[PDB]
Scaffold this active site. Structure first.
Site, PDB file in Angstrom:
ATOM      1  N   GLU A 178       0.827  -1.195   0.000  1.00 61.63           N
ATOM      2  CA  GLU A 178       0.000   0.000   0.000  1.00 61.63           C
ATOM      3  C   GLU A 178       0.867   1.253   0.000  1.00 61.63           C
ATOM      4  O   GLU A 178       1.983   1.258   0.531  1.00 61.63           O
ATOM      5  CB  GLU A 178      -0.912   0.041   1.228  1.00 61.63           C
ATOM      6  CG  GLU A 178      -1.278  -1.323   1.765  1.00 61.63           C
ATOM      7  CD  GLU A 178      -2.352  -1.262   2.826  1.00 61.63           C
ATOM      8  OE1 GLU A 178      -2.382  -0.268   3.579  1.00 61.63           O
ATOM      9  OE2 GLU A 178      -3.169  -2.205   2.906  1.00 61.63           O
ATOM     10  N   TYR A 201     -10.117  -5.425   7.268  1.00 61.40           N
ATOM     11  CA  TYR A 201      -9.192  -4.296   7.258  1.00 61.40           C
ATOM     12  C   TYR A 201      -8.357  -4.164   5.989  1.00 61.40           C
ATOM     13  O   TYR A 201      -8.019  -3.045   5.593  1.00 61.40           O
ATOM     14  CB  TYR A 201      -8.261  -4.385   8.469  1.00 61.40           C
ATOM     15  CG  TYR A 201      -8.952  -4.062   9.767  1.00 61.40           C
ATOM     16  CD1 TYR A 201      -9.304  -2.756  10.079  1.00 61.40           C
ATOM     17  CD2 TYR A 201      -9.272  -5.063  10.675  1.00 61.40           C
ATOM     18  CE1 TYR A 201      -9.951  -2.451  11.265  1.00 61.40           C
ATOM     19  CE2 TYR A 201      -9.921  -4.768  11.866  1.00 61.40           C
ATOM     20  CZ  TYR A 201     -10.257  -3.459  12.155  1.00 61.40           C
ATOM     21  OH  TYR A 201     -10.900  -3.157  13.335  1.00 61.40           O
TER      22      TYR A 201
HETATM   23 ZN    ZN Z   1      -1.942   1.612   5.700  1.00 62.16          ZN
END
Ligand code: ZN
Ligand code: ZN
Lengths: 196, 205
Positions: free
Chosen positions: B83, B156
């Site tokens: 990410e 998540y």
């Molecule tokens: Zn993150």
DNA sequence: GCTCTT
């Protein structure tokens, strides 16, 4: 005559003695070496060491492509001979001088050396003394990059015989039969000798 | 079912800033980055940064082979998501706890981290703050290696969207199709959420 | 360009 620089590259032969801290992956790479001679060759494979050959072969191939890059001159003549020497395996690489002025040859070779350390030793500096050396002219102060004639090849390299002779690669059409053929070498050196 | 350790690895994304003095060979390696998305994927390549991706992919791949070595569990499930985060690129690597008792995980991870610094950053200690961190549990005295449930992945990780989402890799067949497919992610997270809330509501007798 | 070494 085009003229040749000679660079002598020592090839590590004892992994513990010469490449302390090399990866297991490198060990597997050299340990899975299968080299066979070409059908035209009269050399005894039994006197050719496989692991140092793997290392030396990638060394010379990558050296030559890096030389073509820095010299802006592919198809440049070369002759490389890998030998089991006095104390260390080493190879003489002879390259055509065209494309690299002598003054800057030292620096370009240093840059090539660093690329080789990163590429074929994955960052580990080999613990071989003076292992990547352009041959100078009288080893004095400053020196001078020696330039050899093509006649260097029959006078000094072709006469080598096994086990000292390990392998040889070449661009030059005069010598492709002679790289891995001992009798072709004998006849070629005798021809050059009587021709004097 | 077994749990997961989470290691969060910051991936350098500015060469001179994070890997000061790195060889030019490293520069060439990352600058020669061409990654194509698989045909099944619905992501926009134009929002995926290629050089940090090269570093991150090798980072996770070598971490995983080192982990299989350490755990003596070569089939261990994993899920890695790379990410573009708050201020640094990073990736969450989740590995099945089986093989590594919590007491020794700290040192095994230390070893893996040193192996990564040697064989990838070629000896250069990256100047990223807390760049290789097992996630702990309440951050108190000693901490405690947190063990996350598989539900961490849909709760998540899966809901992330570009450009935060950069790439993903997984052992687990539940999430093969989902790694680089935004719609498959949306569907999986929706499925988990409705299933969980409906069976919590069923806990009325 | 190459960190999955002819
Ligand atoms: Zn993150
Ligand atoms: Zn010699």
């Amino acid at each position: 005559m085009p003229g040749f620089y000679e660079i002598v590259i020592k090839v590590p032969s004892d992994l513990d003695e010469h490449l302390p801290g090399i990866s297991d992956s490198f060990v597997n790479w050299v340990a899975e070496k299968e080299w066979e001679l070409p059908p035209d060759s009269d050399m005894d494979l039994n006197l050719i060491e496989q692991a140092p050959l793997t290392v030396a072969e990638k060394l010379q191939r990558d050296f030559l492509t890096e030389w073509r890059r820095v010299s802006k001159a592919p198809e440049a003549l070369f002759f490389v001979q890998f030998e089991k020497g006095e104390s260390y395996f080493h190879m003489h690489v002879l390259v055509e001088t065209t494309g690299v002025k002598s003054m800057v040859l030292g620096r370009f070779l240093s840059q090539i050396r660093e690329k080789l350390i990163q590429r074929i030793y994955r960052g580990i500096e080999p613990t071989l003394p003076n292992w990547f050396a352009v041959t100078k002219t009288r080893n004095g102060a400053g020196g001078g990059n020696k330039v050899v004639d093509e006649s260097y090849i029959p006078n000094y390299l072709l006469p080598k015989t096994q086990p000292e002779l390990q392998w040889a690669w070449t661009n030059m059409e005069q010598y492709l039969s002679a790289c891995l053929n001992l009798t072709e070498r004998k006849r070629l050196v005798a021809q050059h000798l009587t021709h004097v």
